[PDB]
Amino acid sequence: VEDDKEGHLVCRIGDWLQERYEIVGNLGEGTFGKVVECLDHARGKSQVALKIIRNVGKYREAARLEINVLKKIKEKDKENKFLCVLMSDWFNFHGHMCIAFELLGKNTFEFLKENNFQPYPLPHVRHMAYQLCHALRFLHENQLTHTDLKPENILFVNSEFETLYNEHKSCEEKSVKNTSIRVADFGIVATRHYRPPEVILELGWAQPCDVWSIGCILFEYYRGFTLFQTHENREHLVMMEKILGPIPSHMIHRTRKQKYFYKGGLVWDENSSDGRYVKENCKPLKSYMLQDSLEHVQLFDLMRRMLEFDPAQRITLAEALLHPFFAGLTPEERS
Numbered sequence: 001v002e003d004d005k006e007g008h009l010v011c012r013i014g015d016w017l018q019e020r021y022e023i024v025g026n027l028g029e030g031t032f033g034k035v036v037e038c039l040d041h042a043r044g045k046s047q048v049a050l051k052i053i054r055n056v057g058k059y060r061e062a063a064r065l066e067i068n069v070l071k072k073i074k075e076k077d078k079e080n081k082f083l084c085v086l087m088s089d090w091f092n093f094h095g096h097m098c099i100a101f102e103l104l105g106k107n108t109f110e111f112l113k114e115n116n117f118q119p120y121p122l123p124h125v126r127h128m129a130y131q132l133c134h135a136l137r138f139l140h141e142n143q144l145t146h147t148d149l150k151p152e153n154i155l156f157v158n159s160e161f162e163t164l165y166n167e168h169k170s171c172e173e174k175s176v177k178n179t180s181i182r183v184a185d186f187g188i189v190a191t192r193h194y195r196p197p198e199v200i201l202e203l204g205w206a207q208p209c210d211v212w213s214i215g216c217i218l219f220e221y222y223r224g225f226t227l228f229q230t231h232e233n234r235e236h237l238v239m240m241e242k243i244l245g246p247i248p249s250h251m252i253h254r255t256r257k258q259k260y261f262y263k264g265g266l267v268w269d270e271n272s273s274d275g276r277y278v279k280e281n282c283k284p285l286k287s288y289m290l291q292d293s294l295e296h297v298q299l300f301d302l303m304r305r306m307l308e309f310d311p312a313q314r315i316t317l318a319e320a321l322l323h324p325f326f327a328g329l330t331p332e333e334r335s
């Protein structure tokens with residue numbers, strides 16, 4: 001046991017925790033501390049993720065809050081059946097709160113990056129979407145809101161793939177063998193590209209925030225690239241307007257950030273570097289359909305309804321789980 005003045009724990013591959021956890025790898029780091037891989041010698045050689053949070057205090061406090069959140073998700077989920085990440089253990093170790101999870105596979109972003117940003121096929125989209133909706137419905141019902149939904153926070157149970165590619169000129173694609181996912185959270189709300197306009201405009205958010213993000217995420221699974229490829233609010237709102245249509249007067253009246261607008265409209269210099277990028281790449285949403293086909297149109301219908309500007313007219317996760325799009329699930333996918 002040795003601590004540095006930043007507080008954090010100095011651990012080495014081969015160190016043991018709770019006489020059952022043998023560190024074998026490294027999986028992450030962040031504000032709060034490390035995230036290592038162990039084999040659980042108690043539960044018999046099997047593999048876990050272990051977020052370590054040492055001293056600091058706010059860290060320890062927030063770790064407790066996380067554990068509680070995850071405790072409550074288990075209690076409220078009997079059969080594991082709501083597709084959130086599952087805490088298998090937690091403990092206290094010379095001040096360092098630790099939280100063990102079953103080790104899942106690559107997240108939906110990584111997998112996409114490993115596939116050279118070749119989009120997932122429409123059935124995978126459909127299945128992943130169904131589970132994201134189910135999962136966040138369950139969370140919303142228990143007065144919980146993710147707020148930082150994004151592809152990196154969706155993990156595949158198993159990210160093994162069957163590489164398969166013929167005929168297509170440069171066919172070289174990986175289909176993941178099993179599209180089951182789990183929702184995690186690594187820990188202005190949201191990440192830029194998944195952030196909804198009410199957060200951008202500082203109008204307060206609630207559950208409808210998660211739906212907007214889901215909307216954004218589905219698009220990315222479907223095209224391989226992000227729907228809003230930008231890093232600044234004004235551009236982002238302009239992009240919203242050209243992809244989706246105008247912004248309700250009512251949301252412009254309530255913005256205290258009265259800098260992006262002028263006389264009811266977004267200030268926007270159509271002929272700049274930013275101007276040209278938007279002009280030569282942002283087209284109306286429907287135009288990004290890859291095929292002229294019912295299930296693709298169903299998907300864009302759910303997507304448009306998920307990306308309503310007004311959080312109050314935006315579809316709920318309950319209403320989406322009943323959207324025709326989800327007719328095409330295999331019966332097995334249905335659970």
Ligand SMILES: CC(C)(C)c1cc(NC(=O)Nc2cccc(-c3c[nH]c4ncnc(N5CCOCC5)c34)c2)n(-c2ccc3ncccc3c2)n1
Pocket residue numbers: 027028035049050051062063065066069073084085086101102103104105146155183184185186187
């Ligand atoms: C259920 C919900 C809502 C989605 C959630 C999940 C988590 N925690 C989490 O995902 N933790 C976590 C932390 C570290 C690893 C993994 C993880 C679980 N399997 C894995 N299988 C493989 N790799 C993993 N990753 C390692 C790299 O890195 C991403 C996950 C993992 C998961 N939280 C959460 C998080 C932080 C909080 N802070 C304060 C208050 C409340 C908090 C709640 N809420």
